[PDB]
Design an enzyme around this catalytic site. Structure first.
Site, PDB file in Angstrom:
ATOM      1  N   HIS A 171     -22.514  58.898  29.505  1.00 23.78           N
ATOM      2  CA  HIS A 171     -22.611  59.023  28.028  1.00 23.78           C
ATOM      3  C   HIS A 171     -23.899  59.716  27.556  1.00 23.78           C
ATOM      4  O   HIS A 171     -24.568  59.220  26.705  1.00 23.78           O
ATOM      5  CB  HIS A 171     -22.407  57.661  27.389  1.00 23.78           C
ATOM      6  CG  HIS A 171     -20.983  57.241  27.412  1.00 23.78           C
ATOM      7  ND1 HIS A 171     -20.520  56.280  28.265  1.00 23.78           N
ATOM      8  CD2 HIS A 171     -19.916  57.670  26.681  1.00 23.78           C
ATOM      9  CE1 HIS A 171     -19.227  56.112  28.075  1.00 23.78           C
ATOM     10  NE2 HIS A 171     -18.825  56.950  27.072  1.00 23.78           N
TER      11      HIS A 171
ATOM     12  N   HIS B 196     -22.081  65.174  28.299  1.00 22.80           N
ATOM     13  CA  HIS B 196     -20.786  64.716  27.731  1.00 22.80           C
ATOM     14  C   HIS B 196     -20.593  65.190  26.293  1.00 22.80           C
ATOM     15  O   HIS B 196     -19.518  65.714  25.912  1.00 22.80           O
ATOM     16  CB  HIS B 196     -20.736  63.193  27.832  1.00 22.80           C
ATOM     17  CG  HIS B 196     -19.594  62.609  27.089  1.00 22.80           C
ATOM     18  ND1 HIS B 196     -18.304  62.773  27.537  1.00 22.80           N
ATOM     19  CD2 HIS B 196     -19.512  61.844  25.977  1.00 22.80           C
ATOM     20  CE1 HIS B 196     -17.466  62.130  26.728  1.00 22.80           C
ATOM     21  NE2 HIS B 196     -18.163  61.543  25.783  1.00 22.80           N
TER      22      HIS B 196
ATOM     23  N   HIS C  82     -20.721  62.414  18.737  1.00 23.48           N
ATOM     24  CA  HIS C  82     -19.778  61.255  18.735  1.00 23.48           C
ATOM     25  C   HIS C  82     -20.316  60.083  19.577  1.00 23.48           C
ATOM     26  O   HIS C  82     -19.822  58.951  19.410  1.00 23.48           O
ATOM     27  CB  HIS C  82     -18.391  61.690  19.156  1.00 23.48           C
ATOM     28  CG  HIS C  82     -18.235  61.778  20.636  1.00 23.48           C
ATOM     29  ND1 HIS C  82     -18.718  62.817  21.335  1.00 23.48           N
ATOM     30  CD2 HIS C  82     -17.653  60.964  21.526  1.00 23.48           C
ATOM     31  CE1 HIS C  82     -18.433  62.639  22.632  1.00 23.48           C
ATOM     32  NE2 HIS C  82     -17.820  61.514  22.802  1.00 23.48           N
ATOM     33  N   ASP C  83     -21.232  60.316  20.484  1.00 30.18           N
ATOM     34  CA  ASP C  83     -21.783  59.219  21.336  1.00 30.18           C
ATOM     35  C   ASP C  83     -23.311  59.095  21.153  1.00 30.18           C
ATOM     36  O   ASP C  83     -24.016  58.547  22.029  1.00 30.18           O
ATOM     37  CB  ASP C  83     -21.393  59.403  22.793  1.00 30.18           C
ATOM     38  CG  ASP C  83     -20.067  58.778  23.197  1.00 30.18           C
ATOM     39  OD1 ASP C  83     -19.659  57.741  22.608  1.00 30.18           O
ATOM     40  OD2 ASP C  83     -19.401  59.397  24.026  1.00 30.18           O
TER      41      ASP C  83
ATOM     42  N   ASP D 191     -12.543  63.716  24.075  1.00 30.90           N
ATOM     43  CA  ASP D 191     -13.402  62.692  24.692  1.00 30.90           C
ATOM     44  C   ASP D 191     -13.019  62.428  26.136  1.00 30.90           C
ATOM     45  O   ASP D 191     -13.932  62.102  26.930  1.00 30.90           O
ATOM     46  CB  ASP D 191     -13.285  61.403  23.918  1.00 30.90           C
ATOM     47  CG  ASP D 191     -14.449  60.464  24.119  1.00 30.90           C
ATOM     48  OD1 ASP D 191     -15.529  60.852  24.757  1.00 30.90           O
ATOM     49  OD2 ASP D 191     -14.332  59.392  23.587  1.00 30.90           O
TER      50      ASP D 191
ATOM     51  N   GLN E 196      -7.528  54.734  38.455  1.00 31.28           N
ATOM     52  CA  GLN E 196      -7.288  56.071  37.858  1.00 31.28           C
ATOM     53  C   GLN E 196      -5.795  56.295  37.592  1.00 31.28           C
ATOM     54  O   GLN E 196      -5.474  56.814  36.478  1.00 31.28           O
ATOM     55  CB  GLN E 196      -7.900  57.166  38.723  1.00 31.28           C
ATOM     56  CG  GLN E 196      -9.442  57.118  38.726  1.00 31.28           C
ATOM     57  CD  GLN E 196     -10.006  57.387  37.349  1.00 31.28           C
ATOM     58  OE1 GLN E 196      -9.826  58.484  36.787  1.00 31.28           O
ATOM     59  NE2 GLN E 196     -10.576  56.343  36.744  1.00 31.28           N
TER      60      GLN E 196
HETATM   61  C1  LIG Z   1      -9.854  48.634  40.082  1.00 28.82           C
HETATM   62  C2  LIG Z   1      -9.673  49.161  38.657  1.00 28.82           C
HETATM   63  O1  LIG Z   1      -8.965  48.533  37.776  1.00 28.82           O
HETATM   64  N1  LIG Z   1     -10.265  50.392  38.272  1.00 28.82           N
HETATM   65  C3  LIG Z   1     -10.047  50.805  36.871  1.00 28.82           C
HETATM   66  N2  LIG Z   1     -10.610  51.997  36.421  1.00 28.82           N
HETATM   67  C4  LIG Z   1     -10.332  52.239  35.020  1.00 28.82           C
HETATM   68  C5  LIG Z   1     -10.837  53.404  34.354  1.00 28.82           C
HETATM   69  C6  LIG Z   1     -10.524  53.492  33.000  1.00 28.82           C
HETATM   70  N3  LIG Z   1     -11.058  54.633  32.383  1.00 28.82           N
HETATM   71  C7  LIG Z   1     -11.567  55.734  33.013  1.00 28.82           C
HETATM   72  O2  LIG Z   1     -11.553  55.923  34.228  1.00 28.82           O
HETATM   73  C8  LIG Z   1     -12.064  56.756  32.031  1.00 28.82           C
HETATM   74  C9  LIG Z   1     -12.536  56.658  30.696  1.00 28.82           C
HETATM   75  C10 LIG Z   1     -12.746  55.445  29.895  1.00 28.82           C
HETATM   76  O3  LIG Z   1     -11.973  54.413  29.887  1.00 28.82           O
HETATM   77  N4  LIG Z   1     -13.855  55.443  29.067  1.00 28.82           N
HETATM   78  C11 LIG Z   1     -14.356  54.302  28.231  1.00 28.82           C
HETATM   79  C12 LIG Z   1     -15.678  55.104  28.098  1.00 28.82           C
HETATM   80  C13 LIG Z   1     -15.030  56.329  28.890  1.00 28.82           C
HETATM   81  C14 LIG Z   1     -12.792  58.018  30.234  1.00 28.82           C
HETATM   82  N5  LIG Z   1     -12.453  58.866  31.285  1.00 28.82           N
HETATM   83  N6  LIG Z   1     -12.020  58.147  32.324  1.00 28.82           N
HETATM   84  C15 LIG Z   1     -11.584  58.694  33.588  1.00 28.82           C
HETATM   85  C16 LIG Z   1      -9.741  52.448  32.335  1.00 28.82           C
HETATM   86  C17 LIG Z   1      -9.223  51.322  32.998  1.00 28.82           C
HETATM   87  C18 LIG Z   1      -9.498  51.186  34.366  1.00 28.82           C
HETATM   88  S1  LIG Z   1      -9.161  49.913  35.512  1.00 28.82           S
HETATM   89 MG   LIG Z   2     -17.963  56.802  22.708  1.00 26.49          MG
HETATM   90 ZN   LIG Z   3     -17.517  60.136  24.360  1.00 26.62          ZN
END
Ligand SMILES: CC(=O)Nc1nc2cc(NC(=O)c3c(C(=O)N4CCC4)cnn3C)ccc2s1
Ligand SMILES: [Mg+2]
Ligand SMILES: [Zn+2]
EC number: 3.1.4.17
Length: 313
Positions: free
Chosen positions: A68, A72, A106-107, A217, A269
């Site tokens: 963040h 980004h 935005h962040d 985002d 993912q």
């Molecule tokens: C073992 C296990 O459950 N692993 C897990 N990984 C994740 C990853 C995500 N989200 C992400 O990976 C993500 C975000 C994201 O949510 N953001 C909030 C601030 C950026 C933005 N880009 N990307 C790729 C959500 C739920 C799970 S549950």
């Molecule tokens: Mg944000």
């Molecule tokens: Zn952001």
């Protein structure tokens, strides 16, 4: 008046593409942003001296966290530039001005922790803003920087145009709160499938800009695989630090945040692509057909995470 920003040839061509990566050279990122404003908006949109001072104060108010951060901010602004450039005629003058600024801002002053963590810590910001905690903070920091001496990039707007652009920016920044995304996308999905979606209806434009903000985002999932994969390490570096801070409050973090569960990242993912990313770019593509390359790149990346699970990497 007669002073253009120009980039080297590879950047001049690749910056127009959705999957452009802004590079490791921090000192070139202000120039890439001004370049995008000049082509998205006009060389007349902003006083150069004021815009430069604004960009540098915005940069200064992003912190040195793994994900963040200032990089980004500029990355999310570039995705918005590519949506706006592929949809020339759909957006107002104030929207083109407001949305690149919204994306850069935005962040603002993010510390690497979720709204949930602030509420469990009992952070002062969680008393001041009971929902969308960090997003109301980011908007507050945006108005702060806009009111510094010599930083008012909207000074040439009237009182009512100024108020409209700050309202575009406010809604666009609030929309980056992913808790709000699920319902926003459901409503857009129903509106598009009953054919009641109307872009002259302000509440509808608002929803469509909210979904663009989510798309920009999340745009690390729309990059070439090596960019997507190395970004995911920065995202998880933050999540796992939050997990550690949860354990210091005597709370088992969700597995997303527990470094002991690094093994489960590929399946994590998959859940994220299936529940958030793919649906986001799907509905965006139905509303704005020229954004299909973001959906295509997201699907390419899900297939790469599926290969990681099958041990083919
Ligand atoms: C073992 C296990 O459950 N692993 C897990 N990984 C994740 C990853 C995500 N989200 C992400 O990976 C993500 C975000 C994201 O949510 N953001 C909030 C601030 C950026 C933005 N880009 N990307 C790729 C959500 C739920 C799970 S549950
Ligand atoms: Mg944000
Ligand atoms: Zn952001």
């Amino acid at each position: 008046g007669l002073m253009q920003f120009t980039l080297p040839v590879r950047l001049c061509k690749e910056i127009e593409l959705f999957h452009f990566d802004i590079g490791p050279f921090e000192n070139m990122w202000p120039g890439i942003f001004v370049y995008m404003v000049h082509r998205s908006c006009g060389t007349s949109c902003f006083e150069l001296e004021k815009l430069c001072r604004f960009i540098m104060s915005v940069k200064k108010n992003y912190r040195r966290v793994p994900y963040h951060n200032w990089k980004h901010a500029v990355t999310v602004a570039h995705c918005m530039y590519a949506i706006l450039q592929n949809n020339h005629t759909l957006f107002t003058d104030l929207e083109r001005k407001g949305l690149l600024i919204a994306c850069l801002c935005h962040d603002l002053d993010h510390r690497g922790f979720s709204n949930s963590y602030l509420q469990k810590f009992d952070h002062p910001l969680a008393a001041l803003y009971s929902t969308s905690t960090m997003e109301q903070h980011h908007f507050s920091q945006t108005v702060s920087i806009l009111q510094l001496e010599g930083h008012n990039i909207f000074s040439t707007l009237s009182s009512s145009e100024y108020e409209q652009v700050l309202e575009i920016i406010r809604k666009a920044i609030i929309a980056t709160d992913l808790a709000l995304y699920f319902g926003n996308r459901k409503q857009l999905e129903e509106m598009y499938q009953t054919g009641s979606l109307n872009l002259n209806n302000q509440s509808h434009r608002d929803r469509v800009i909210g979904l663009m903000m989510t798309a920009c985002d999340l745009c690390s999932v729309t990059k070439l695989w090596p960019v997507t994969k190395l970004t995911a390490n920065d995202i998880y570096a933050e999540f796992w630090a939050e997990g550690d801070e949860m354990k210091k409050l005597g709370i088992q973090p969700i597995p997303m945040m527990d470094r002991d569960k690094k093994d489960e990242v590929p399946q994590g993912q998959l859940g994220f692509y299936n529940a958030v990313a793919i649906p986001c770019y799907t509905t965006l593509t139905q509303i704005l057909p020229p954004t299909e390359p973001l959906l295509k790149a997201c699907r390419d990346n899900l297939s790469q995470w599926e290969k990681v699970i099958r041990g083919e990497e």
